[PDB]
Design goal:
Chain C: It holds the Pfam family Ribosomal_L32p. Chain C: This is Large ribosomal subunit protein bL32. The structure is cut from a larger assembly and holds chains A (110 residues), B (117 residues), C (57 residues) and D (129 residues). Chain A contains no helices and six strands. With 110 residues, chain A is mainly beta. Chain A has one domain. In chain A, the strands form two sheets. Chain A has a four-stranded antiparallel β-sheet with strand order 1-2-3-6, with no helix packed on it. Chain A has a two-stranded antiparallel sheet with strand order 4-5. In chain A, a hairpin with a 7-residue loop joins strand 1 and strand 2. In chain B, helix 1 runs parallel beside helix 2, helix 2 crosses helix 4 and helix 3 packs across helix 5. The longest helix of chain C is centred in the N-terminal third of the chain and has 7 residues. Chain C is 12% helix and 11% strand. Classes of the chains: A mainly beta (110), B mainly alpha (117), C little secondary structure (57), D alpha+beta (129). Chains C and D meet through loops of C and helix 2 of D. Bound molecules: calcium ion (CA) (2 copies) and magnesium ion (61 copies). Chain D binds three RNA strands through helix 1, strand 1, helix 2, helix 4 and strand 2.
Chain lengths: 110, 117, 57, 129
RNA sequence: GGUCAAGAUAGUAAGGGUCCACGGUGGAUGCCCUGGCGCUGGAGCCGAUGAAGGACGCGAUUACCUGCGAAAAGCCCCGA
RNA sequence: AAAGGUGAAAAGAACCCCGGGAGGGGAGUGAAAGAGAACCUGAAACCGUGGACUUACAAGCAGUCAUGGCACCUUAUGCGUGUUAUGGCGUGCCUAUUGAAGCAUGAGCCGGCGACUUAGACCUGACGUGCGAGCUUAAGUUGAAAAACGGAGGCGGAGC
RNA sequence: GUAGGGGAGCGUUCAGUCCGCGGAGAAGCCAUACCGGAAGGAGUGGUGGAGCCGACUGAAGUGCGGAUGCCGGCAUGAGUAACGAUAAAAGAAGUGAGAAUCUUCUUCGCCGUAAGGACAAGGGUUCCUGGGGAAGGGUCGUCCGCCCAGGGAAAGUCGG
C-alpha cells in the first residue's frame, strides 16, 4: 500500500519545534519535536510514550525487561503554535535579510 | 455490470434445507436430496389431505357398526333405518355418540329398528 | 476382475463397524514395594522390584 | 451484572479457560489419538496419568503431555486443589493436512494425507458431587 | 403377607438415528485496495558515439529485486 | 499456475507455569487478544464432544397423514415447537422416450464459476410518444458540469 | 396439462433522484413457532466491526441440480492394500527428553569378473568439520545424499 505521502511528502513542521497534540488520549498536550520522519508522517514528542516489553533475552542481558520509551504519532497532532494553543499557519514572508520564509499565524513569527 | 450469484443461492438453499427436520441421513444435510425429497413429499401432502377425509370416514363407520351390532343390528340395517326415520339425519360422526353415550346410541338403535318395521 | 465398492457407505453404517475398536484399559496394580504404577506378571518399572531388585532402574 | 451493550462487556469481563490446555497441529491422525483419548475420558486425573504410561500406543505421549499441562494450569493459574482433579472433558479434532504425491504403478500418482491433530483436555474438581 | 400357577409389562445400548448446545476443519459471503480493463486525448522511433535484450560484477554484513558499472546503490556542473 | 487483509498505532506479547520442542494457560498492552502473527469476516460439505427423545423380531426411495408418549416454552401455552412409538398410504431426480422406480443416460458431497447475447442509418410486426399530408435527419461545425446547429440524403404522395 | 403462444409479477448488481439509517454499531453470517396468492418480505435475539436499507426511474456479465460440466475443499472404500527383491541377524556398551533403527565392541550371514577398485559422460557442493531435527527418509531417528554455517579444489611435464 503506498503510504504517508498523500501529504505530498511534506512536513508541516521542523525537527526541533514545540508542538501540541490534538487527536486522542494526548489532545491538548505539548512537547518538543524529536524525530520527524516525513515519508511515513511520523512524529515523536516528549511525553506520549509507553511500555515496550523488551527482547526476552540477550540484548547483552539474560532477563528481558520492560522500560518506558517514545511512541510516535502520525501528523495527527497539530503543529506550530504561539498565540498559545491550536493555531493554523500561513505566513512565509521574509525575516531579516529578506530571505528566510519564516512562519506566522494570525500573529507573529514562529 | 457483473451481477454474481452471491447471497441469493445460499438463502434459497437454506430455506429448502430448513424444511428438512428429522429427515434421515443426507436428506437433512445435502441440498440436492433435501429438495428432491421435497418433490415426492409434495405428492404425498396433497394426496394425503384428500385421503384423510376419506380415512376418518372409515374410522367413523368402523366404530358405528361395532356399536350397532352390540345392539344386534349391523351398520347397513341401521344408517338405513335412521334415514328411513327421515328427519333423523344427525349423520355426522354418530361414531362419537356410539363411543361415549351408550344410553343414547341404544335409543337410536330403537329408533332405527322402529322405522324398519 | 477388479472389485470396487458400489455405493458410498453411510456415516451410520460405517460408524457401526467401528463398534469394536475400543481399546482395553491396562489392568494396573499398585506395586507393594515402590510407590504405585505396575503391570501384572511384570517388573515394577520405577523401582525395579519383582520381589527384590531385578533391573537396574 | 447486566451490562450496557457488548463493547461494554468486552472491557469489563475477560473470557478465561479454567482447566484447559490444547496441543495444536500434533502430527498424528485424529481417529488414532481418539482411541487413546477415549481411554482417558472421565477418569480421575491421576489414573489418566497412570493409564497413559502403559497404553502401548504412540499417541499416548502427546496425549499425556497435554494432560500434564491441563493439570498444571488448573493448579498454577486456576488455584484448584489437585486431589479433586479429574478429566471433565477431552476430545480431538482435525488439524490442517499435509499432502504428498507418491508415485504408483504405470505412471499415476496419488495424494497421501498426513493428518494433524488438535488434542485438548479440560480438568475440573470432582466437587461435582 | 409367603410360597406355587397363569398372564401382562418395564428398564440395560455395544453401537446407531433426529433435534439442540459447543467447537474443529475449510475459505464461500460481506467490506477494502496496493491490481487490472476499455474509451478519450496526448506523444511516438532506437542503434557503429554500441541499440533492443542479457551475462558478470559494485554493499561493513547481500540470497532476491532496484540502481549503477572497475571512477561501479555512484562521480562533476546548474536550478528548485 | 495459485496468489491478498493484526491493530488507529507494534504499543508485535517482559515475567511466570506444563513441555526437548511444537503447542498452550496466565500477567501485561490495546477500545477489542470475542485482533496474537496458520493474525478481518468465517457460510457449506466433512470430523468431533455434551445433552434431550429414542432404537437390539426387524422387510424399510427414507417421506406423508393420523393418533398416543416424553421433553420444552424469547415471532411461543398454541390450529404450538422438538422428538418418538404405532396405523394407513407411498416405485429417487433429470434426460431420452410409444412407454422409466427401472437391471436405460448423467451424477461421491458441498461451495463458488457456468449457457438465447451483441451489432447495423438492415428488414417485418405489436405497444407508446412527437409532429401530421407531411415526417426526419447523416457525416460534420461550434459549444460541452449542459446542447444547439447541420436538408446532403431517406420514407409517404401513382399506377400498369 | 408436455412442446408452444399470451398475462401479471418476485429477487440480484450497477446508475440517477428522493427519504433516511450507522461505533449506544452498518453490510455479511447464525437461529426462529410472524407475514404475503408465489417468487419472497419483515420482527426479535446471537455474531460482526464500517458501511447500508426503503421508494421511483433507468441498464444488465441478473436467478443452477444436473452438462462422464470447471476450480477448490472435503468425504467413501478403511485403520483396509501396501511399506519396493527370502543376502539373516544377535548380545553387550554408549549418547539422549526420547532408541529394534544413531555410535562403539564382539560374533553371525551376503557379494567377491562383485554387490571390490580406477576413469569417461552426465550431476553440481551432494565432499570434510561443527551444529540442527520442521518438512524430505515409505516406520523411528539422537542419523542421513535432508537444513544452517565455516573450510576443501593448487600442474612448464596428466586431459583440452
Ligand atoms: Ca485391523
Ligand atoms: Ca475390505
Ligand atoms: Mg399418498
Ligand atoms: Mg356416513
Ligand atoms: Mg472376467
Ligand atoms: Mg516411472
Ligand atoms: Mg459407547
Ligand atoms: Mg479446514
Ligand atoms: Mg461488505
Ligand atoms: Mg486503478
Ligand atoms: Mg544495455
Ligand atoms: Mg558492492
Ligand atoms: Mg542484479
Ligand atoms: Mg577506468
Ligand atoms: Mg547541487
Ligand atoms: Mg492493516
Ligand atoms: Mg507450539
Ligand atoms: Mg511458548
Ligand atoms: Mg485494559
Ligand atoms: Mg483466542
Ligand atoms: Mg477475530
Ligand atoms: Mg501457533
Ligand atoms: Mg478493519
Ligand atoms: Mg479469521
Ligand atoms: Mg462425545
Ligand atoms: Mg451424542
Ligand atoms: Mg427373533
Ligand atoms: Mg422390539
Ligand atoms: Mg435389514
Ligand atoms: Mg413411521
Ligand atoms: Mg425405446
Ligand atoms: Mg412405466
Ligand atoms: Mg438401480
Ligand atoms: Mg439409473
Ligand atoms: Mg443411449
Ligand atoms: Mg457410473
Ligand atoms: Mg434507415
Ligand atoms: Mg455504412
Ligand atoms: Mg450494534
Ligand atoms: Mg429471513
Ligand atoms: Mg474501525
Ligand atoms: Mg451468464
Ligand atoms: Mg434441469
Ligand atoms: Mg454439479
Ligand atoms: Mg473435483
Ligand atoms: Mg511388492
Ligand atoms: Mg544392534
Ligand atoms: Mg543417561
Ligand atoms: Mg518425540
Ligand atoms: Mg534391518
Ligand atoms: Mg547405519
Ligand atoms: Mg566397549
Ligand atoms: Mg565398481
Ligand atoms: Mg563434469
Ligand atoms: Mg566439478
Ligand atoms: Mg557426509
Ligand atoms: Mg563425521
Ligand atoms: Mg554432518
Ligand atoms: Mg524428524
Ligand atoms: Mg526449521
Ligand atoms: Mg519420518
Ligand atoms: Mg614439480
Ligand atoms: Mg596435450
Amino acid at each position: 500500500p503506498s503510504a504517508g505521502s498523500h501529504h505530498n511528502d511534506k512536513l508541516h513542521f521542523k525537527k526541533g519545534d514545540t508542538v501540541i497534540v490534538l487527536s486522542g488520549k494526548h489532545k491538548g498536550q505539548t512537547g518538543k519535536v524529536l524525530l520527524a520522519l516525513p515519508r511515513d508522517q511520523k512524529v515523536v514528542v516528549e511525553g506520549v510514550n509507553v511500555i515496550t516489553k523488551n527482547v526476552k533475552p540477550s540484548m547483552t542481558n539474560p532477563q528481558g525487561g520492560q522500560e518506558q520509551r517514545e511512541l510516535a504519532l502520525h501528523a495527527s497532532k497539530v503543529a506550530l503554535v504561539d498565540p498559545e494553543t491550536g493555531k493554523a499557519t500561513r505566513v512565509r514572508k521574509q525575516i531579516v535579510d529578506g530571505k528566510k520564509v519564516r512562519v506566522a499565524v494570525a500573529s507573529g513569527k514562529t | 455490470p457483473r451481477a454474481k450469484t452471491g447471497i441469493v443461492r445460499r438463502r434459497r438453499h437454506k430455506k429448502v434445507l430448513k424444511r428438512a427436520k428429522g429427515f434421515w441421513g443426507s436428506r437433512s444435510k445435502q441440498y440436492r436430496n433435501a429438495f428432491q425429497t421435497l418433490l415426492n413429499a409434495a405428492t404425498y401432502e396433497y394426496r394425503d389431505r384428500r385421503n384423510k377425509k376419506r380415512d376418518f370416514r372409515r374410522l367413523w363407520i368402523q366404530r358405528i357398526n361395532a356399536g350397532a351390532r352390540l345392539h344386534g343390528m349391523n351398520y347397513s340395517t341401521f344408517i338405513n333405518g335412521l334415514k328411513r326415520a327421515n328427519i333423523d339425519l344427525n349423520r355426522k360422526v354418530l361414531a362419537d355418540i356410539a363411543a361415549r353415550e351408550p344410553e343414547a346410541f341404544k335409543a337410536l338403535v330403537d329408533a332405527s329398528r322402529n322405522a324398519r318395521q | 476382475k477388479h472389485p470396487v465398492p458400489k455405493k458410498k457407505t453411510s456415516k451410520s453404517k460405517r460408524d457401526m463397524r467401528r463398534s469394536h475398536h475400543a481399546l482395553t484399559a491396562p489392568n494396573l496394580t499398585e506395586c507393594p514395594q515402590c510407590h504405585g504404577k505396575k503391570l501384572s506378571h511384570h517388573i515394577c518399572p520405577n523401582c525395579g522390584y519383582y520381589d527384590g531388585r531385578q533391573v537396574l532402574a | 451484572q447486566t451490562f450496557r451493550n457488548k463493547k461494554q462487556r468486552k472491557q469489563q469481563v475477560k473470557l478465561r479457560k479454567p482447566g484447559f490446555a490444547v496441543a495444536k497441529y500434533v502430527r498424528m491422525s485424529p481417529r488414532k489419538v481418539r482411541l487413546v483419548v477415549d481411554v482417558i475420558r472421565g477418569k480421575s486425573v491421576q489414573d489418566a496419568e497412570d493409564l497413559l504410561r502403559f497404553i502401548p500406543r504412540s499417541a499416548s505421549e502427546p496425549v499425556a503431555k497435554v494432560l500434564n499441562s491441563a493439570k498444571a494450569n488448573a493448579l498454577h493459574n486456576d488455584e484448584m486443589l489437585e486431589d479433586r482433579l479429574f478429566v471433565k472433558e477431552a476430545y480431538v479434532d482435525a488439524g490442517p493436512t499435509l499432502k504428498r504425491l507418491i508415485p504408483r504403478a504405470r505412471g499415476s500418482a496419488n495424494i497421501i494425507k498426513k493428518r494433524t491433530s488438535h488434542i485438548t483436555i479440560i480438568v475440573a474438581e470432582k466437587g461435582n458431587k
